[PDB]
Amino acid sequence: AFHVEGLIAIIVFYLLILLVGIWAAWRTKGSAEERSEAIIVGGRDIGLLVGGFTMTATWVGGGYINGTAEAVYVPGYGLAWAQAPIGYSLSLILGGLFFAKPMRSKGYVTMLDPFQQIYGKRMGGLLFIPALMGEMFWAAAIFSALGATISVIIDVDMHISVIISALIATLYTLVGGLYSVAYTDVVQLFCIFVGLWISVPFALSHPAVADIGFTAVHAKYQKPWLGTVDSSEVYSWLDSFLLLMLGGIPWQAYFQRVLSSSSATYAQVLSFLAAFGCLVMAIPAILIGAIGASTDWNQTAYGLPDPKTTEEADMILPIVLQYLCPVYISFFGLGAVSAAVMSSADSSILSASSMFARNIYQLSFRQNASDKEIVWVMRITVFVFGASATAMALLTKTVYGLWYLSSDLVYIVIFPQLLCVLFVKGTNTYGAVAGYVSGLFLRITGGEPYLYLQPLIFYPGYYPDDNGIYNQKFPFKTLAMVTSFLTNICISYLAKYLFESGTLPPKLDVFDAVVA
Ligand SMILES: C[N+]1(C)CCO[C@@](O)(c2ccc(-c3ccc([C@@]4(O)C[N+](C)(C)CCO4)cc3)cc2)C1
Numbered sequence: 001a002f003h004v005e006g007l008i009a010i011i012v013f014y015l016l017i018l019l020v021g022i023w024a025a026w027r028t029k030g031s032a033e034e035r036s037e038a039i040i041v042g043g044r045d046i047g048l049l050v051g052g053f054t055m056t057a058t059w060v061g062g063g064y065i066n067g068t069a070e071a072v073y074v075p076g077y078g079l080a081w082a083q084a085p086i087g088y089s090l091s092l093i094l095g096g097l098f099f100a101k102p103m104r105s106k107g108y109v110t111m112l113d114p115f116q117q118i119y120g121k122r123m124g125g126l127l128f129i130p131a132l133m134g135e136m137f138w139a140a141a142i143f144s145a146l147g148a149t150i151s152v153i154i155d156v157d158m159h160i161s162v163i164i165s166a167l168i169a170t171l172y173t174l175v176g177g178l179y180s181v182a183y184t185d186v187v188q189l190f191c192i193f194v195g196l197w198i199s200v201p202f203a204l205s206h207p208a209v210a211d212i213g214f215t216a217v218h219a220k221y222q223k224p225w226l227g228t229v230d231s232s233e234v235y236s237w238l239d240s241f242l243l244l245m246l247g248g249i250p251w252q253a254y255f256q257r258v259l260s261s262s263s264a265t266y267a268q269v270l271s272f273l274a275a276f277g278c279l280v281m282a283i284p285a286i287l288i289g290a291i292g293a294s295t296d297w298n299q300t301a302y303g304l305p306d307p308k309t310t311e312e313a314d315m316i317l318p319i320v321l322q323y324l325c326p327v328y329i330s331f332f333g334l335g336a337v338s339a340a341v342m343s344s345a346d347s348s349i350l351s352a353s354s355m356f357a358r359n360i361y362q363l364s365f366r367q368n369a370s371d372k373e374i375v376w377v378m379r380i381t382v383f384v385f386g387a388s389a390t391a392m393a394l395l396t397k398t399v400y401g402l403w404y405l406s407s408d409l410v411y412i413v414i415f416p417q418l419l420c421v422l423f424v425k426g427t428n429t430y431g432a433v434a435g436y437v438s439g440l441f442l443r444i445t446g447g448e449p450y451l452y453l454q455p456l457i458f459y460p461g462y463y464p465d466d467n468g469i470y471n472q473k474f475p476f477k478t479l480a481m482v483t484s485f486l487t488n489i490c491i492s493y494l495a496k497y498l499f500e501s502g503t504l505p506p507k508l509d510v511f512d513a514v515v516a
Contacts (some may be wrong), residue, residue, distance in 0.1 A: 002155050002250075006331040010154075013191075013335055014168050017184055017342070021172030024183035025384075028176075036362065036374045040064030040354045041109050042260040046182060052270045054182040055257040056277035057189035059088055059248075061344025062149065062337045063142040063403075065196075065285045066317050072289025073316040074308060078227015081237065083288070085282035087244030089275045091100025095249045096271025100258045102422050104267040110358050111255040114421045119429045120511060121364045127417060128355055131252055132408040135352035136389055139345040141403035143393035146341040149318045153334045159394055166393075167340065169346045170386030174379050178260065181346050182434065188339040189277075195336025196284035199321060199329050203291045206324045208299040212287075215294040225293040232473075239475030246481070247411030250418045252351035253344075287318070291324065292316040300324060314400075349389060353382045405443075408477055412439040416485040424489065429513040431492025439484035446476045 030038025037043075046054075064084055073083035108114060112131065116124035147162035154161075172180045203209065216226045229237050248254070261267035297306040300323045307313055321333035357378035362369060393399060416435055420427045447455030449471050455462075457476035498504050499514040506515055 003327065006327070007154055007156070008067075009331060010335060010338065013170055013338075014164070017187065017241060017339075018168050019171050020178035020187055021136070021176055021184045025172075025180045027178030028179040028183075034357075034371060036371045036378075039375070039378055040358055041180040041256070042182065043120065043264060044107075044260065045259040046257075047215045047262055048266045048270055048273075050182060050186055051257055051261055051266070052127075052273040052277065053189050054185040055254065056274040056281065057185040057192065057340070057343040058190070058253055058257065058347040059092075059274070059278055059344070060192060060281045060340055061142045062341035063344070064088075064336065065282075066145055066149075068282060068285040069289035069292065069317040069320075070314050072225050072286055073292045074250050074313050075223035075293075078223065079225055079286065079290075080227040080229050082227075082286065083237070083244055085279055085286070087241055088248055088278045088282075091245050091248035092271050092275035094245065095254065095258075096268045096275065099249055099418070099422070100271050101264060102269045103255055104261055105264045107446065108255075108259055110259070110355055111250070111252045112359055113357055115417060116359055118357060118421050118427070118513075119417075119432050120513070121198065121359075123429055123432055123436075125360050125364060126214040127414060128156050128360055130406070130410050130413050131250075131355060132352050134406045135252060135348045136385065136392065137399065137403040139348040139352070139389040140393040140396075140399050142341045142345050142348075143268065144399050145315075145389055146338060146345075147393065148315060149334065149337050152315065152318045153322050153330060157457055162394055163390055165342060166345070166386055166390035169342050170349060173346050173350045174382045174386075177378070178256070178350065181350055182257075182260075183319040185343050185347075188343045189281075191339040192281065192336045192343075195332045195334075195339070196281070196288075199325050199333040200291075202325045202329045203288060203320055206295075206300075208295050208297075209291050209324065210294065210296070211288055212294050215290070223340055228460060235475050236473060239478050242478045243408065243411055246415055247407060250410065250414040252355055253347040256347075256351050256354060288317055288320050292320045295320070295324065305322045343387070349382065349386050353378065353385045356381045356385075396480050398450065401448060405448050405451065409440070409443050412443050412477065412480050412484060416481060416488055419485065420488055426492065426496060427488065428492045428495050431488040431490070431496040433511075434491035435488030438487050439480055442476065442480035442483060446480065448471060455474040 030043040068082050068084045070381050071077045072079050112128055112500040114126055115127050143162050143166055146165055147158045150156055150161040151158040157358070172184065184333065204212065216224055258267045258271065261270055298304045302319060302323045307316060307319055312319070317337065319332070321330045325333060357374055361377060362374050413436060416439070417432060420432070447453045447470070449465055449467070449469055450468070452469055455470055455472060458470065459476055461471045461473035462470050463473060496514055499509065500507065511516060
């Protein structure tokens with residue numbers, strides 16, 4: 001049914017989030033003369049607990065919670081394939097151990113600044129394109145998740161709620177800039193904690209749900225939610241787990257926080273603290289997914305068939321909140337999900353707009369530009385990116401598959417480039433271009449089942465799906481990343497050797513990286 005009392009509550013919650021963001025904008029209104037990087041990096045005064053809470057709320061979005069609950073819920077995957085929590089936690093631990101220290105110790109402004117200073121502005125933009133694509137598609141996917149969830153719970157028209165949520169998020173991130181998004185994430189993360197953790201005892205107390213512990217090791221209604229990994233599917237699970245471990249590092253939304261930490265040590269400690277917060281935040285998602293897996297849906301008001309029959313298994317968190325939990329607990333859970341989506345999409349929108357106005361515009365297009373012009377183009381870029389993200393979320397039905405493809409492409413392309421600039425010395429532009437081309441070519445020829453793209457190269461173990469398109473059981477993603485990294489090293493060293501030995505003319509080179 002349509003309950004106004006609760007729609008009013010969520011509108012009030014949105015207004016309070018916007019008011020907190022506006023207050024954070026007003027109070028902390030950076031450098032006195034250089035306000036171009038008083039929005040991007042925040043003035044380097046973000047502390048430890050605030051930054052940890054902020055970036056913890058950045059990774060915990062509604063798409064992440066719904067994906068974990070889906071992976072736990074469905075019988076084929078189970079908990080063993082719910083590799084999002086431990087994948088994110090190991091990603092953050094690995095980043096804080098190795099990548100966080102050199103990024104913050106010397107004062108970079110964004111993610112892409114080390115790429116430009118080594119590979120030239122053209123390759124800086126060429127690496128910006130996958131990052132922008134990934135951020136925009138991730139924001140669109142989680143906005144579509146919010147739209148579907150709110151259309152399920154309150155039964156609001158879907159094209160209004162996502163527009164209002166995106167408008168409010170864009171408005172406060174436009175007005176403040178890394179202080180309106182980091183002083184509201186300490187509120188949104190607490191709201192996520194409250195809304196997710198209160199609903200779990202209410203869901204468990206429902207008479208339909210019975211013996212959540214017993215369903216882990218035994219099967220009564222469906223396959224056990226604990227799940228298993230087959231002998232033949234070890235390589236695919238390792239491929240996806242490496243995707244989640246190593247593709248979660250090179251995002252703009254992560255390095256914008258580690259650069260904003262007050263000191264170098266409070267960046268690594270922030271990363272570890274958030275790697276603990278991610279598991280703390282993901283425990284309720286796993287519990288609710290197990291509750292949905294164990295629930296006898298005939299007893300509830302949802303009725304039979306169960307959601308996995310009606311192809312609604314991608315959303316099992318909102319159904320449990322709406323049907324198993326009471327009305328006000330359902331609104332608490334919906335507020336938690338909306339806070340998670342606004343936090344992650346706000347981080348993505350500010351992060352994707354913190355690369356456009358910083359280097360491809362200010363450092364590439366208009367090198368000599370006034371700071372006020374850069375601030376204004378930052379604000380209009382935030383607004384345009386928010387409008388594009390919500391329009392792509394609302395108008396396109398193929399957002400999830402494009403999100404997965406863009407995240408996989410970011411992992412294949414940017415991460416070898418990220419590891420080459422810092423850890424490896426003597427990497428040139430030619431090897432970077434060769435790695436880009438090889439990674440893009442292998443990812444395109446691998447194909448995607450969601451986009452109905454036929455794979456040009458058939459890896460061993462390929463099998464056709466129900467829709468009639470070939471799927472690759474071979475771990476071509478991590479193999480593509482390894483091939484890109486190896487060919488980056490090989491082409492860089494070969495070009496350096498050729499230009500040092502004198503086989504090629506010193507004037508023939510176009511990128512001029514080796515000579516100068
Ligand atoms: C079962 N499906 C629905 C289809 C098969 O693939 C999946 O297991 C799956 C789930 C999640 C992902 C995924 C990939 C990347 C990311 C992300 O890019 C998102 N963040 C940017 C939030 C963190 C870094 O990792 C999140 C989820 C990829 C595949 C999900």
